[PDB]
Amino acid sequence: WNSNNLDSKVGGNYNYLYRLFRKSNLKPFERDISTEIYQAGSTPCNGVEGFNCYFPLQSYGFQPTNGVGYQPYRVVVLSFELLHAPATVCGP
Amino acid sequence: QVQLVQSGAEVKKPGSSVKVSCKASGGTFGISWVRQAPGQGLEWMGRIIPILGTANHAQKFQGRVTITADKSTGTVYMELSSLRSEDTAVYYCARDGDSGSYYETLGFDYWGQGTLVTVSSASTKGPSVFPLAPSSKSTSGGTAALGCLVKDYFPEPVTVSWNSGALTSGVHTFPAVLQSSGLYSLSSVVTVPSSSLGTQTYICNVNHKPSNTKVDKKVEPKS
Amino acid sequence: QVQLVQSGAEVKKPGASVKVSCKASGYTFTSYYMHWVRQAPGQGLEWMGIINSSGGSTSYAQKFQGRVTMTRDTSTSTVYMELSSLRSEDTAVYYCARPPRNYYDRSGYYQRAEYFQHWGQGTLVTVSSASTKGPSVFPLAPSSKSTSGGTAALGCLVKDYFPEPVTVSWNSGALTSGVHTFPAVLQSSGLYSLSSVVTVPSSSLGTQTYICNVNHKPSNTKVDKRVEPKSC
Amino acid sequence: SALTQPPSASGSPGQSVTISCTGTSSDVGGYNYVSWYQQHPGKAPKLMIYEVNKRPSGVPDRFSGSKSGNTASLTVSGLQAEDEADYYCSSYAGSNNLVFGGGTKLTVLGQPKAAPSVTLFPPSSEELQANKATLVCLISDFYPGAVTVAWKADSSPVKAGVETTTPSKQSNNKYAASSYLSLTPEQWKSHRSYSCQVTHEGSTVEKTVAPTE
Amino acid sequence: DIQLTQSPSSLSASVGDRVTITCQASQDISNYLNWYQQRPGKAPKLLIYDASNLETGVPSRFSGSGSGTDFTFTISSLQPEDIATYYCQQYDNPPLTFGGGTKLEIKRTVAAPSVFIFPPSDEQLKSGTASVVCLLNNFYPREAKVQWKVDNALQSGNSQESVTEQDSKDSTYSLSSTLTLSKADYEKHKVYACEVTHQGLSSPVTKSFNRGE
């Protein structure tokens, strides 16, 4: 659902990040919070950002004046796993 | 449609600060600046990737270079402070990769035109424009030569056009001369059919931006 | 990475049957529908049918009803499509395609999402009487000192083959810059012919070796040819 | 400084020129981000080679880059007159450091001498009305770029008040220079004629000018 | 069966131009329409789905809109790599159908062809047929006249031409003219010339060779 009112503010909100670079794609339901300087080229990077060496995370920059396509949306993903265990979650 | 348009022909007193702009047209990942002193070689200054927020400086320009960009306008600014006589040079923009491909090749594909920043104590002067009239010596070949003399101006550069830019065929604007006085002078010649000497009027337009001087001059044969 | 690999191009006599294979890799096979799309040479795209990778449920188009059969093997993660009673109209390229998963609405309405994100490379099925023939590869050398002027052009001529297509690479695929593989030409003899040229710096004419690799799968013919300039 | 590029390589049409760009292990030897730029005098640099051996879209195949140890090399195979320009090399010197070379002025040898085309303009009435005078001698379309200018007063040399520019390459690969003689209206109107003489490769071209009353 | 009509069937625009294609459906499909970009030889590439949604990885310059029976697909600034055939597809009701297609081409500045000739190989002469090839590399527009002159006699009805698709980078064309003769007829004559006349050529360019050198 749209949350432009709650998440964006004047001059843009920079508290929300996303990872732009990673050595490999994520496995399903994986979380990578490492901030290693991503090596995009043949240069070593030596732990400092620079030529072909970028910070892995990036700021969304939610301006209130942004188009619908660039407005902050909040997402909730419900996963219903059924294993060989007692089913402990049910409804009416 | 992937051109970089560089603004400015600014003159600055030593110790002041200059800000040069590059407008990117088409897709541009990162824009780098490269300076070239008159007669000398190229030297790198810094690089910016507006989509990422990182900026670079050469070690020699630590504390003096500030590279910014405004995405709303799509332009990139580079500010050099504490200028001296060593900084008098031409400043170029450079494209580092297309709008995609977050890679940096370190080869600069498209370059902007020159932006000359003359740093000098000495006061600007402004040109004196005189018409160089044709004769039977220059006209009898079916093609005559007209000209304009832009004398005693400082600093560079001066822009000379003909008929507000409506005449480009056969225009040769000679390089400037550094006089003993430390002032510049140049000439701009044009080859025109002799038949049009009486029908069409030939105006030369001289523009010296450092002095905000604009001079039109009519070149006619001397009777 | 998601990948759909289809079987080699085939030539079949009119009235026979073709079976085209589409092997899925890089995603759980039994979680997406597989669709087939045929495209005649020069014409547009035409839908053929859908197969359910899980249960095997199949729905073919009315135009192909009774003549097309879609098969599925879960262990090998592959989809087969068989067209029988072939005619001259069926000479075309056949693609498999995976759309995303169909989702349920908030209201509980089954919402189909039949847009094709991933396609195979295509399988050309040539329907013809004519017998297959193997190609003859010849070197087109820049005998004339086109090296003077900094740029040389070398080439390979793939003459008298049937049917389409042939794959021509340079240096086993290690050279793609400045490669022009011309479209095939149907000669008066009813056989195809084409040329593949490459522009290279004259400086590299002596330093790097230039091999052209021609591969005609319908005839199981693979020919490498080393192209050297003719010295007059 | 910081790189060694030989200032002055030269070649002949059809032949091949190899321009060198020598660094150390830490800049040129170690990493594969090397670029070659061609710059015609008065124009902006153009990229010819990037990442050692990669020609960008629109660069002829004549220009071929290479590398060996600590020395990159640009090879021009199909030498033409147009290739007469300044060639710079750039390389990665480390994170946040890019180093350029001194530049190599590539001279193509074969070219036929071109005689200098000279035009002499007398002072304008407007200028004379301001108690000043200036003769203008414009020299264009000569090769090589080496001319010597002399001013004669009726017969006799004038060495004072002369300002001659250094020859510079035009768009058409030939050279151009200008020479201004600043004089007083008295000197101008007190002589029969002035003359600008341009000596080029042993040959000479004279243009004369006289007042109009 | 829902019919889809595409307008136009072909078009040519310059670099940076804004391009617009229309897809009309015989029935109402709310927005269950998709846009594909099929390049020559390759498979279709999905650019727009649900008639308005940009597929992950598509440049910002592409857009789509429309509803009911009428949909439009728009390109902000036409880039050289956009040359392909664009199709529309519906999935509102089985069976799925595609539009006619819209072959989009680039309008480019006039470029001259590089002309090369290739005599028949020594190997092919063993087989009885001889093939002489003429290559016209990287030109525009697509039209070009290629004449075969055998001993300065014009050959006809013996040559075939093949033209590549427009290049995704420089938007140029290339052409191959193959002249096939018998070995007997080939050995009858000496001078084999390919004469190319093109818009970007001031005069007809002739690339010839003598048999047996």
mmCIF file of N, CA, C and O in Angstrom, chain E residues 92-119:
data_model
loop_
_atom_site.group_PDB
_atom_site.id
_atom_site.type_symbol
_atom_site.label_atom_id
_atom_site.label_comp_id
_atom_site.label_asym_id
_atom_site.label_seq_id
_atom_site.Cartn_x
_atom_site.Cartn_y
_atom_site.Cartn_z
ATOM 1 N N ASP E 92 -6.759 -11.307 -22.576
ATOM 2 C CA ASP E 92 -8.036 -11.147 -21.902
ATOM 3 C C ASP E 92 -8.888 -12.400 -22.077
ATOM 4 O O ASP E 92 -9.618 -12.783 -21.165
ATOM 5 N N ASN E 93 -8.796 -13.018 -23.257
ATOM 6 C CA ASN E 93 -9.589 -14.194 -23.565
ATOM 7 C C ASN E 93 -8.789 -15.097 -24.502
ATOM 8 O O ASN E 93 -8.181 -14.618 -25.454
ATOM 9 N N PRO E 94 -8.753 -16.428 -24.260
ATOM 10 C CA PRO E 94 -8.121 -17.357 -25.201
ATOM 11 C C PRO E 94 -8.842 -17.344 -26.544
ATOM 12 O O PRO E 94 -10.049 -17.125 -26.597
ATOM 13 N N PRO E 95 -8.122 -17.554 -27.668
ATOM 14 C CA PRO E 95 -6.671 -17.715 -27.654
ATOM 15 C C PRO E 95 -5.932 -16.380 -27.737
ATOM 16 O O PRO E 95 -6.506 -15.380 -28.164
ATOM 17 N N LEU E 96 -4.656 -16.381 -27.329
ATOM 18 C CA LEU E 96 -3.827 -15.187 -27.379
ATOM 19 C C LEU E 96 -3.518 -14.843 -28.832
ATOM 20 O O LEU E 96 -3.314 -15.724 -29.659
ATOM 21 N N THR E 97 -3.474 -13.541 -29.119
ATOM 22 C CA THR E 97 -3.206 -13.073 -30.468
ATOM 23 C C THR E 97 -2.175 -11.949 -30.422
ATOM 24 O O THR E 97 -2.030 -11.262 -29.406
ATOM 25 N N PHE E 98 -1.471 -11.781 -31.546
ATOM 26 C CA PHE E 98 -0.455 -10.754 -31.681
ATOM 27 C C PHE E 98 -0.828 -9.800 -32.815
ATOM 28 O O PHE E 98 -1.493 -10.190 -33.774
ATOM 29 N N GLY E 99 -0.354 -8.555 -32.702
ATOM 30 C CA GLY E 99 -0.476 -7.562 -33.757
ATOM 31 C C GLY E 99 0.330 -7.906 -35.010
ATOM 32 O O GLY E 99 1.096 -8.869 -35.041
ATOM 33 N N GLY E 100 0.146 -7.087 -36.051
ATOM 34 C CA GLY E 100 0.803 -7.292 -37.330
ATOM 35 C C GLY E 100 2.310 -7.087 -37.228
ATOM 36 O O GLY E 100 3.093 -7.702 -37.955
ATOM 37 N N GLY E 101 2.698 -6.207 -36.305
ATOM 38 C CA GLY E 101 4.082 -5.794 -36.194
ATOM 39 C C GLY E 101 4.320 -4.409 -36.795
ATOM 40 O O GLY E 101 3.625 -3.992 -37.720
ATOM 41 N N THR E 102 5.314 -3.712 -36.233
ATOM 42 C CA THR E 102 5.693 -2.383 -36.675
ATOM 43 C C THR E 102 7.210 -2.311 -36.830
ATOM 44 O O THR E 102 7.930 -2.106 -35.854
ATOM 45 N N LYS E 103 7.692 -2.491 -38.062
ATOM 46 C CA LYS E 103 9.123 -2.426 -38.286
ATOM 47 C C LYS E 103 9.552 -0.967 -38.159
ATOM 48 O O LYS E 103 9.150 -0.127 -38.950
ATOM 49 N N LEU E 104 10.348 -0.675 -37.130
ATOM 50 C CA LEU E 104 10.862 0.660 -36.887
ATOM 51 C C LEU E 104 12.315 0.767 -37.359
ATOM 52 O O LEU E 104 13.154 -0.073 -37.031
ATOM 53 N N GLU E 105 12.604 1.826 -38.126
ATOM 54 C CA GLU E 105 13.943 2.026 -38.665
ATOM 55 C C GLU E 105 14.476 3.389 -38.234
ATOM 56 O O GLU E 105 13.703 4.205 -37.742
ATOM 57 N N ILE E 106 15.784 3.612 -38.415
ATOM 58 C CA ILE E 106 16.399 4.871 -38.034
ATOM 59 C C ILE E 106 16.677 5.677 -39.296
ATOM 60 O O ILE E 106 17.120 5.132 -40.310
ATOM 61 N N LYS E 107 16.398 6.983 -39.211
ATOM 62 C CA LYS E 107 16.815 7.940 -40.223
ATOM 63 C C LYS E 107 18.159 8.521 -39.775
ATOM 64 O O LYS E 107 18.280 9.076 -38.671
ATOM 65 N N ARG E 108 19.181 8.325 -40.615
ATOM 66 C CA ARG E 108 20.554 8.617 -40.233
ATOM 67 C C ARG E 108 21.179 9.569 -41.248
ATOM 68 O O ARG E 108 20.649 9.779 -42.335
ATOM 69 N N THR E 109 22.308 10.162 -40.862
ATOM 70 C CA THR E 109 23.125 10.960 -41.757
ATOM 71 C C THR E 109 23.716 10.050 -42.834
ATOM 72 O O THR E 109 23.955 8.873 -42.603
ATOM 73 N N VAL E 110 23.962 10.614 -44.014
ATOM 74 C CA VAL E 110 24.466 9.856 -45.148
ATOM 75 C C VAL E 110 25.889 9.396 -44.842
ATOM 76 O O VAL E 110 26.729 10.210 -44.465
ATOM 77 N N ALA E 111 26.136 8.086 -44.990
ATOM 78 C CA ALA E 111 27.461 7.498 -44.815
ATOM 79 C C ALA E 111 27.887 6.719 -46.061
ATOM 80 O O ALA E 111 27.075 6.035 -46.682
ATOM 81 N N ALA E 112 29.177 6.811 -46.402
ATOM 82 C CA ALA E 112 29.723 6.186 -47.597
ATOM 83 C C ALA E 112 30.142 4.755 -47.288
ATOM 84 O O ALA E 112 30.627 4.481 -46.198
ATOM 85 N N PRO E 113 29.984 3.800 -48.232
ATOM 86 C CA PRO E 113 30.378 2.409 -47.999
ATOM 87 C C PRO E 113 31.869 2.170 -48.207
ATOM 88 O O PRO E 113 32.493 2.786 -49.066
ATOM 89 N N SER E 114 32.438 1.290 -47.377
ATOM 90 C CA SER E 114 33.769 0.768 -47.629
ATOM 91 C C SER E 114 33.631 -0.426 -48.566
ATOM 92 O O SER E 114 32.871 -1.349 -48.281
ATOM 93 N N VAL E 115 34.356 -0.389 -49.687
ATOM 94 C CA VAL E 115 34.163 -1.383 -50.732
ATOM 95 C C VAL E 115 35.357 -2.327 -50.764
ATOM 96 O O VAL E 115 36.491 -1.885 -50.923
ATOM 97 N N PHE E 116 35.080 -3.631 -50.638
ATOM 98 C CA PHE E 116 36.113 -4.657 -50.700
ATOM 99 C C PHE E 116 35.725 -5.716 -51.726
ATOM 100 O O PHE E 116 34.541 -5.962 -51.957
ATOM 101 N N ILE E 117 36.740 -6.352 -52.324
ATOM 102 C CA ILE E 117 36.509 -7.404 -53.298
ATOM 103 C C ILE E 117 37.264 -8.661 -52.877
ATOM 104 O O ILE E 117 38.349 -8.575 -52.314
ATOM 105 N N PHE E 118 36.669 -9.822 -53.162
ATOM 106 C CA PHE E 118 37.268 -11.106 -52.843
ATOM 107 C C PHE E 118 37.178 -12.002 -54.071
ATOM 108 O O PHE E 118 36.081 -12.387 -54.489
ATOM 109 N N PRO E 119 38.325 -12.330 -54.711
ATOM 110 C CA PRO E 119 38.347 -13.298 -55.810
ATOM 111 C C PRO E 119 37.931 -14.682 -55.308
ATOM 112 O O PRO E 119 37.794 -14.900 -54.106
#
